[PDB]
Amino acid sequence: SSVALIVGVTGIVGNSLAEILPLADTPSGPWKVYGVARRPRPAWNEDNPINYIRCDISDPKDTQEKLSPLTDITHVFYVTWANRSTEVERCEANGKMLKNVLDVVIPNCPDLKHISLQTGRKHYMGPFELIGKIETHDPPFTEDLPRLKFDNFYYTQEDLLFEEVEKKEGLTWSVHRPGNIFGFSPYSMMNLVGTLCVYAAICKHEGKVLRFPGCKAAWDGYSDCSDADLIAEHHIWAAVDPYAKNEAFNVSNGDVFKWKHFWKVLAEQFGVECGEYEEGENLKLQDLMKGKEPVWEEIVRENGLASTNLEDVAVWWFSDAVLDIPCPLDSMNKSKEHGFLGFRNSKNSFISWIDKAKAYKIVP
Amino acid sequence: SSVALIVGVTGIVGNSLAEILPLADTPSGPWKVYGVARRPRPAWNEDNPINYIRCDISDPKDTQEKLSPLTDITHVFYVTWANRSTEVERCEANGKMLKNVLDVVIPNCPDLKHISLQTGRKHYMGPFELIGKIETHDPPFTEDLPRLKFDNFYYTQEDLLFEEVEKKEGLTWSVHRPGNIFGFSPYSMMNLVGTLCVYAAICKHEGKVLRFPGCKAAWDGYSDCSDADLIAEHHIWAAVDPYAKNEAFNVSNGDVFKWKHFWKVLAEQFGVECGEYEEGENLKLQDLMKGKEPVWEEIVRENGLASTNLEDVAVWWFSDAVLDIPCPLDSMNKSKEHGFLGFRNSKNSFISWIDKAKAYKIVP
Numbered sequence: 125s126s127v128a129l130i131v132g133v134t135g136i137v138g139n140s141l142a143e144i145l146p147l148a149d150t151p152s153g154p155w156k157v158y159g160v161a162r163r164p165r166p167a168w169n170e171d172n173p174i175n176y177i178r179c180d181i182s183d184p185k186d187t188q189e190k191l192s193p194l195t196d197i198t199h200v201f202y203v204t205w206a207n208r209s210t211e212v213e214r215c216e217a218n219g220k221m222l223k224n225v226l227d228v229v230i231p232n233c234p235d236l237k238h239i240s241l242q243t244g245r246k247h248y249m250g251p252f253e254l255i256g257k258i259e260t261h262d263p264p265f266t267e268d269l270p271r272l273k274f275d276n277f278y279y280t281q282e283d284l285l286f287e288e289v290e291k292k293e294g295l296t297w298s299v300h301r302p303g304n305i306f307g308f309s310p311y312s313m314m315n316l317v318g319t320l321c322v323y324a325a326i327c328k329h330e331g332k333v334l335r336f337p338g339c340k341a342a343w344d345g346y347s348d349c350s351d352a353d354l355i356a357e358h359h360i361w362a363a364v365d366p367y368a369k370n371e372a373f374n375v376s377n378g379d380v381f382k383w384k385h386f387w388k389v390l391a392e393q394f395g396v397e398c399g400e401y402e403e404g405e406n407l408k409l410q411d412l413m414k415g416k417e418p419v420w421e422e423i424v425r426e427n428g429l430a431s432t433n434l435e436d437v438a439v440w441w442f443s444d445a446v447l448d449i450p451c452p453l454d455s456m457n458k459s460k461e462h463g464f465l466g467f468r469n470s471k472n473s474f475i476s477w478i479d480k481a482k483a484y485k486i487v488p
Numbered sequence: 489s490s491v492a493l494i495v496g497v498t499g500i501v502g503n504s505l506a507e508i509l510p511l512a513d514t515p516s517g518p519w520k521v522y523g524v525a526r527r528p529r530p531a532w533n534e535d536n537p538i539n540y541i542r543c544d545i546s547d548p549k550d551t552q553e554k555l556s557p558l559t560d561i562t563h564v565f566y567v568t569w570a571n572r573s574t575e576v577e578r579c580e581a582n583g584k585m586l587k588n589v590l591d592v593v594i595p596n597c598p599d600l601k602h603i604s605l606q607t608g609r610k611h612y613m614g615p616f617e618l619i620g621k622i623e624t625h626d627p628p629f630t631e632d633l634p635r636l637k638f639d640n641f642y643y644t645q646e647d648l649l650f651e652e653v654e655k656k657e658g659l660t661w662s663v664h665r666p667g668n669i670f671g672f673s674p675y676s677m678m679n680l681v682g683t684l685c686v687y688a689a690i691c692k693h694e695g696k697v698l699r700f701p702g703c704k705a706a707w708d709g710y711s712d713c714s715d716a717d718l719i720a721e722h723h724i725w726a727a728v729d730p731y732a733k734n735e736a737f738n739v740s741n742g743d744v745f746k747w748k749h750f751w752k753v754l755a756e757q758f759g760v761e762c763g764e765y766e767e768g769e770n771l772k773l774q775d776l777m778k779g780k781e782p783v784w785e786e787i788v789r790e791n792g793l794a795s796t797n798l799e800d801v802a803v804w805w806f807s808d809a810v811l812d813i814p815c816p817l818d819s820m821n822k823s824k825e826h827g828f829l830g831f832r833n834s835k836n837s838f839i840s841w842i843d844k845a846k847a848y849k850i851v852p
């Protein structure tokens with residue numbers, strides 16, 4: 125029997141794993157699923173048949189208490205993180221979180237077969253506060269070239285993971301490195317689509333132009349992204365395919381796009397006039413959206429939306445961090461050469477995730 | 489039974505179709521193959537079991553004479569063209585060539601099922617003498633948006649093809665739009681790999697640096713390419729899959745690269761010092777390689793190579809035309825959404841095609 129532990133079940137990838145693992149056509153099914161997060165289970169996560177567990181994995185005692193009874197786990201899908209002001213502190217916090225889970229699950233789960241760890245493109249680009257400031261490898265990024273000579277919590281986590289699997293014979297691992305994720309999760313710390321939807325809804329309410337809050341390279345250079353359901357499929361594939369064992373893999377959609385084009389799509393989905401990149405404006409959502417909580421309460425009330433806090437559904441700092449830089453591309457050759465041929469049409473994916481935020485009444 | 493007519497059998501895609509169609513694992517096999525070209529069959533095309541036919545398809549009488557007895561043809565793969573000083577003349581010449589073939593094959597082949605026409609990315613970029621001078625659609629290019637408002641022999645050929653298929657019930661068509669092709673054919677009019685190999689061999693012989701004869705955007709912007717075997721697979725797939733009928737499709741490798749990286753690969757394969765793009769040098773192979781015929785004869789003699797004419801094996805004007813422009817990307821979403829999941833790792837493909845030119849003793 126296959127028994128999953130999703131660490132971060134209400135996250136942008138955790139929520140996609142929660143929906144896909146229990147499906148009839150999922151490989152190695154039928155899957156039993158445990159899902160971990162700290163907050164009470166939100167309404168938009170209820171449409172999935174998972175065993176929800178409240179647990180703060182930064183707390184070793186809580187991790188011991190909540191996870192030690194789950195002796196039937198066969199596959200761990202680790203899809204969470206903690207943000208801090210410096211990468212050094214991110215290494216400390218994130219290493220402890222992964223260590224707390226693995227130290228409990230490995231000795232208590234005799235049928236444990238695989239640990240899948242989600243990291244991301246900052247493995248190649250560097251930490252948030254070094255992006256654009258350091259020499260990186262030239263894109264498109266490939267998986268197995270040397271690491272940057274700077275601390276990175278993904279390196280800390282990979283090294284801990286490799287040491288942890290040594291504790292159990294036959295225990296394999298995988299690493300998954302998405303770019304910017306397009307998905308659904310009103311609780312995610314990094315949700316570009318959800319944040320852009322809230323910005324578009326505020327522009328619509330105020331009768332304002334959907335101005336582009338980003339740089340020229342993000343507007344008309346190439347970009348890519350990683351669909352959350354495709355990432356969930358990629359975690360499942362690496363967890364069950366023996367030819368994918370003990371490898372790190374990028375996971376992006378298999379196409380490229382330009383924000384100059386997707387901006388028209390976003391504007392059309394909210395009935396707003398589409399703006400365009402303007403040289404010298406240096407527009408930031410974190411600044412434009414300051415003090416917009418009463419406007420959000422009004423949009424929620426007038427449109428019969430689910431009651432959300434603006435700071436949870438719109439992570440302005442993250443949208444600015446994405447859109448204020450060029451988007452270096454990555455390579456899907458290693459995944460495809462290992463037999464993973466999943467892809468997504470990114471424009472159709474963007475519309476799908478905008479429409480899911482509308483379907484769950486998060487935005488109008 | 490499946491019976492192919494390859495129009496341009498010694499070409500860069502024709503030679504790949506000649507090798508792949510007769511294979512045991514090819515869909516709709518066993519294939520009987522007729523291959524057409526004007527010149528006597530060259531030695532490097534003999535390792536394939538095809539029925540070689542000498543025919544100049546610009547001559548209606550020769551086309552009537554050579555093709556009317558081939559009553560068993562079921563699938564036409566059209567992979568040839570004629571170059572002229574203007575696109576207007578290319579429309580005239582290329583339209584007549586395709587018309588001469590189809591006017592004979594359609595009424596004489598009662599079991600004719602499909603016509604596959606190869607065109608290319610200039611459908612979106614414009615003719616050679618307009619590239620960079622006109623407004624095009626923004627990349628990545630997709631297949632079914634309006635044509636440019638300039639003459640293009642691909643438009644002439646598509647329109648002729650659509651009118652021709654009306655002559656026979658159930659006759660379907662496909663169009664295939666590669667980018668720059670990586671393949672093998674010492675007779676091809678557009679062979680980037682073969683030409684770069686000859687340039688590298690001349691640099692090695694002369695003890696010179698492999699300088700980059702192209703622009704900054706070609707050096708460190710993104711590029712893509714189309715592997716000739718993948719294009720041949722794409723022609724076969726569209727010719728046999730009923731869900732691909734009556735559609736135009738791009739065909740590129742599914743990855744991107746930079747010439748800054750591939751230049752190191754090319755240099756390593758010929759044991760030459762690798763040069764780099766130099767601002768202000770504006771290097772052209774058509775100029776650098778002027779008068780190099782005696783040097784080529786010497787390399788051929790010293791390395792026991794097949795006897796080739798420098799102007800046939802190295803199409804300098806074409807390498808300059810490719811490398812002196814940015815490479816706009818295209819999209820493989822329509823092909824993948826129709827079930828074609830073939831891809832190639834472009835770096836491995838480049839090495840494979842360099843090594844095939846070495847294996848047939850075209851270059852050292």
Ligand SMILES: NC(=O)c1ccc[n+]([C@@H]2O[C@H](COP(=O)([O-])OP(=O)(O)OC[C@H]3O[C@@H](n4cnc5c(N)ncnc54)[C@H](OP(=O)(O)O)[C@@H]3O)[C@@H](O)[C@H]2O)c1
Pocket residue numbers: 131132133134135136137138160161162163164179180181182202203204205206221242243244245302303304305306309311312313314315316
């Ligand atoms: N999202 C993107 O665009 C993106 C892009 C590339 C890479 N990545 C990488 O993907 C990895 C996973 O992040 P994600 O974006 O998928 O996460 P996410 O959407 O922010 O979800 C995090 C999940 O973990 C839970 N969680 C947070 N802290 C926890 C703790 N201490 N104990 C238990 N549960 C906890 C959250 O719920 P509670 O708050 O209720 O606990 C939520 O369920 C990270 O390495 C991230 O950098 C993400």
Ligand SMILES: NC(=O)c1ccc[n+]([C@@H]2O[C@H](COP(=O)([O-])OP(=O)(O)OC[C@H]3O[C@@H](n4cnc5c(N)ncnc54)[C@H](OP(=O)(O)O)[C@@H]3O)[C@@H](O)[C@H]2O)c1
Pocket residue numbers: 495496497498499500501502524525526527528543544545546566567568569570585606607608609666667668669670673675676677678679680
């Ligand atoms: N090669 C590339 O990089 C590239 C890239 C994108 C698109 N394309 C497009 O692909 C299409 C096909 O070109 P290709 O590059 O595959 O061709 P190619 O490699 O130049 O081969 C042409 C073939 O057709 C034969 N041929 C030429 N004129 C003929 C005639 N009048 N009658 C009979 N046979 C004739 C040639 O042999 P003989 O000379 O012995 O007759 C050769 O076998 C064109 O539309 C081209 O623009 C090519």
Ligand SMILES: CC(C)=CCC/C(C)=C/C=O
Pocket residue numbers: 246251252253255304442444445446448449
């Ligand atoms: C830190 C800055 C200026 C940009 C970050 C780009 C990005 C969204 C990376 C990983 O998430």
Ligand SMILES: CC(C)=CCC/C(C)=C/C=O
Pocket residue numbers: 610615616617619668806808809810812813
């Ligand atoms: C005409 C110029 C300057 C570049 C042509 C680029 C290219 C190789 C297109 C199609 O074959």
Ligand SMILES: [Cl-]
Pocket residue numbers: 243244245246247302
């Ligand atoms: Cl990341």
Ligand SMILES: [Cl-]
Pocket residue numbers: 607608609610611666
């Ligand atoms: Cl072309």
Ligand code: NA
Pocket residue numbers: 380381382385386627628
């Ligand atoms: Na686009």
Ligand code: NA
Pocket residue numbers: 351353354468473476
């Ligand atoms: Na999707």
Ligand code: NA
Pocket residue numbers: 263264744745746749750
């Ligand atoms: Na490259």
Ligand code: NA
Pocket residue numbers: 715717718832837840
């Ligand atoms: Na190949």
